[PDB]
Structure formats: C-alpha cells, structure tokens
Write a protein that binds this ligand. Structure first.
Ligand SMILES: Nc1nc2c(ncn2[C@@H]2O[C@H](COP(=O)(O)OP(=O)(O)O)[C@@H](O)[C@H]2O)c(=O)[nH]1
Ligand SMILES: *C/C=C(\C)CC/C=C(\C)CC/C=C(\C)CCC=C(C)C
Ligand SMILES: [Mg+2]
Ligand SMILES: [Mg+2]
Lengths: 200, 191
C-alpha cells in the first residue's frame, strides 16, 4: 500500500515558519532614475557602475524584463540530463514522466535573463501536490539582479530526496517566478515521479 | 595544496554609521583624516586565519532609502554580512531590527551575519554623551547588544572603533570564521 489520505499529516511543515518582522518592498525606482540621483558623487557613480555594468540594451517591445530560459537538475548520480525549456510551449510538461531517484542529494540550476530594469528580490516558489493535496510549500530566493546580455545561472542549496519506502508516488508540481513587486514573470505546472531506481 | 577560498563580506547599516571608515581603516590602517568617500570601492585582501590563506572581498553599501533597490544587487553570493550601528546613536541601533536584519535575511536566507558596534571611543566622550543623556538616551553596552544579537540570531556581536582601531582586525577575523561555519540544513523534506 503506497499512499492513503495521511497526506494531510505530512503538512508537519507548511506555514508557521513566517514569524518575522516583514521586509518592506523597495520603491519602484528605475535605472535611469538611479543613474541621475547623485551624479555629483564620484564614489557613488563607481558604485552604480560596478553593480549596473554599462550599456547593451536590445529588444524593448516584444521582450519583457525577465525571461527564464530553463531549470536544470544538477545531480552527479543522475545518468540522464533533467531540464525544462521554459520557452514557448509549457503544456508539454503536463504529460511528462520526470523520474528522480529517492534519497539522492541534489540542487536546482535556475537560468534566467534580465533585459531592461532591475528585478528586486526574485524568488522561485514551488508547490508539491500528491493526489491534489498541497503537501509542501518552498521558497528559493534568487535575489535582485541587473540587466545584461549574458544570462545568469543561480543554484539552490543541496537538498535530499525523500525515501520511497512510503511516498514514492507521482506528484503534480505548480511553480512560478515572482518578486518583491508581485510581478508574475512565469507560471507553469509539471509532473514528477519518485522511484527506487534511476530510470527503472 | 588546496585552492584559495574567497570570502565575500558585505557591510550594511544606516548612513554615517561608519561602514566606510571602518573599511579604509582596516585596509590601510590609517583612519580617514580629511577625505571620506560615500562608498569604499570593492576590494580584496589575503587574510591569514588558522594557518590558511583567504581572499577577503570587502563590500561597502549605500544605506539610503534612495538605494533600497540598488543595494541588494551586491547581496547574491555573499558569505557574511556585517550589520553595523554606532554606539552613540540609538537611531541606527533601532534601525538594525527594523530595516537591516530583515533586508538581509530576506535576500540571503541561510547567510550568517554579525552586529557591529562602530565608534566605541565615543562610549566615553564629552560632546557626544552631552546630547545623549539629555534626550533620554544613553550609550549601548556589549550586554545590551548581545541580547539583540542572540534575539536576531546573529553569529555574534563585536564592536570596534575605526578611530582607535580597537577590535577592528578582530571584526574581520570573526567575519571570516563566521563565514567558514557550515550551513546546517534544517530543511528536512522527508517525513
Ligand atoms: N570619532 C569618530 N568618528 C568616526 C569614526 N568613524 C567614522 N567617523 C566619522 O563619522 C562620519 C560618518 O562615518 P562614515 O564611515 O562615512 O559612515 P557611513 O555612511 O556608514 O559610511 C564621518 O564624519 C567620519 O569621520 C570613529 O571611529 N570615530
Ligand atoms: C514528506 C514529503 C514527501 C513525502 C514528498 C514531497 C516531494 C518533494 C518535496 C519533491 C521536490 C521535487 C523537486 C524540488 C523537483 C526538482 C526537479 C527538477 C528541478 C527537474
Ligand atoms: Mg578548486
Ligand atoms: Mg559609506
């Protein structure tokens, strides 16, 4: 017997880990505005230059500020590559069989690209569902970034995979990339499956 | 032998609290007499700790509200934060709990940090204590700060004077050690 409705008991995490004096999002200023705030201060210009770099801004119409390219599963034990082309068709992910061997330590490689402005405190929210029940809430802060031609590649901390002796089923995963401005850059769903062996 | 490891140290705190002077003081040994920039340039220094070379990268910040959006651009990949506050200035000490700690814990979850009492020479100074004890406000003590630090879960509390360089070399030594201590998961996904 794999699973029952003891999924609600698994919520021995959920929400109660908030208890913190809230941050407070920063005003919605902009690069050009930042650039003109203290032109008089040589020290501050050097400061903005190190953080903001210099020039190179392409497509303004079609292209949004943030554009996630992919999500890669970095694992030394995984024989076959695990990626998700977060470009174009996303419905395809609603019928894939993503296997992930139990108990293995792993990490996520987020690959995005900032185009025009600053992305303040961008985060990756992941919701894990089993039989329609949300049994896990997870937030991976990526941080604030500036616009540039070359793509960024963020890695999440090393985490362990669950032991299949019980919960070795298939999950519905809902994910989205938002930020301090509540802007929803992307949102999609996909299915993952735990097993006892790699590609069994 | 083994590769040289880099420690990225980011200093935060309100304006005029002494983040900049503390950095020039530490990297040149000479306190800034005449000139003092808004922001100290990104700088690296080899530091010997426990018999091992470490490249300590130093990052000064523009703590104004005007830069609450720009400032965090340096936060990614940080190894340790140094939240600083002047002893003879409760306005900063308060802002530590209100603005600072939440800003860094928001952007860098599992990243350690320390509280820094800047200007300890002023704990005992005429003109400064003068305006203090007047408006119902007195200088902070290690005991006072250690309470807030442990409350905030800061690796530790350290203090110093960029003027008298008392405790300076030590602030960065603890900064290094604070950054060497392993993460400690506490993110158990199994049930
Ligand atoms: N007496 C005294 N003044 C200091 C010390 N450190 C900085 N100052 C002075 O305090 C003011 C602000 O400090 P600064 O380092 O620029 O603040 P920041 O905005 O946090 O960088 C300047 O006028 C400095 O000369 C100190 O250790 N002792
Ligand atoms: C007690 C928790 C149980 C029994 C199961 C919960 C399942 C989790 C938490 C799975 C996490 C899956 C991830 C993070 C997917 C990563 C894969 C890619 C990024 C391809
Ligand atoms: Mg190496
Ligand atoms: Mg400064």
């Amino acid at each position: 017997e794999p699973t029952a409705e003891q999924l609600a008991q698994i919520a021995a995490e959920n929400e109660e880990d908030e208890h913190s004096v809230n941050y407070k999002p920063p005003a919605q200023k902009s690069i050009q505005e930042i650039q003109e705030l203290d032109k008089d201060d040589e020290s501050l210009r050097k400061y903005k230059e190190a953080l903001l770099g210099r020039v190179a801004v392409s497509a303004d119409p079609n292209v949004p500020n943030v554009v996630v390219t992919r999500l890669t599963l970095v694992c030394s034990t995984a024989p076959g590559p695990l990626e998700l082309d977060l470009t174009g068709d996303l419905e395809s992910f609603k019928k894939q069989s993503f296997v992930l061997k139990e108990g293995v330590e792993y990490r996520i490689k987020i690959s995005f690209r900032v185009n025009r402005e600053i992305v303040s405190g961008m985060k990756y929210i992941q919701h894990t569902y089993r039989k329609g029940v949300k049994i896990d809430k997870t937030d991976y802060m990526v941080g604030s970034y500036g616009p540039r031609a070359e793509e960024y590649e963020f890695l999440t901390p090393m985490e362990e995979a669950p032991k299949g002796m019980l919960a070795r089923g298939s999950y519905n995963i809902k994910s989205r990339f938002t930020d301090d401005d509540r802007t929803d850059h992307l949102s999609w769903e996909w299915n993952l499956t735990i097993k006892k062996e790699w590609k069994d | 032998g083994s590769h040289m490891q880099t420690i990225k140290c980011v200093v935060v705190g309100d304006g005029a609290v002494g983040k900049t002077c503390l950095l020039i003081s530490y990297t040149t040994n000479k306190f800034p007499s005449e000139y003092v920039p808004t922001v100290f340039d990104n700088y690296a220094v080899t530091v010997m700790i426990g018999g091992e070379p470490y490249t300590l990268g130093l990052f000064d910040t523009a703590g104004q509200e005007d830069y609450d959006r720009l400032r965090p651009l340096s936060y990614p990949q940080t190894d340790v934060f140094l939240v600083c506050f002047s002893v003879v200035s409760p306005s900063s000490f308060e802002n530590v709990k209100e603005k600072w700690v939440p800003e860094i814990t928001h952007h860098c979850p599992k990243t350690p940090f320390l509280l820094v009492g800047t200007q300890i020479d002023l704990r005992d100074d005429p003109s400064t204590i003068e305006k203090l004890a007047k408006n119902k406000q007195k200088p902070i003590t290690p005991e006072t700060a250690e309470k807030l630090a442990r409350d905030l879960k800061a690796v530790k509390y350290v203090e110093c004077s960029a003027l008298t360089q008392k405790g300076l070399k030590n602030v960065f030594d603890e900064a290094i050690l604070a950054a060497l201590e392993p993460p400690e998961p506490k993110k158990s996904r199994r049930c």
